[PDB]
């Protein structure tokens, strides 16, 4: 349930249902921690109170 900063998208792929999945390089870690994440896991965050 926590959110981690994405440093780089290293690879993409389409599943059987035609939706995209991205191989995520997580900031602060190396290539061993890369994970394929569904498209909707990528979030843009802005300040909530301004």
């Amino acid at each position: 349930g926590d959110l981690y900063e994405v440093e780089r998208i290293v690879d993409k792929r389409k599943n059987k249902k035609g939706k995209w999945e991205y191989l995520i390089r997580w900031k602060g870690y190396g290539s061993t921690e890369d994970t394929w994440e569904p498209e909707h896991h990528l979030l843009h965050c802005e300040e909530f109170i301004d």
């Binding site: 981690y4 900063e5 994405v6 994970t35 994440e37 569904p38 990528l42 979030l43």
Partner: peptide
Amino acid sequence: XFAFKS
């Protein structure tokens, strides 16, 4: 950006 790690 950020992403869920699931």
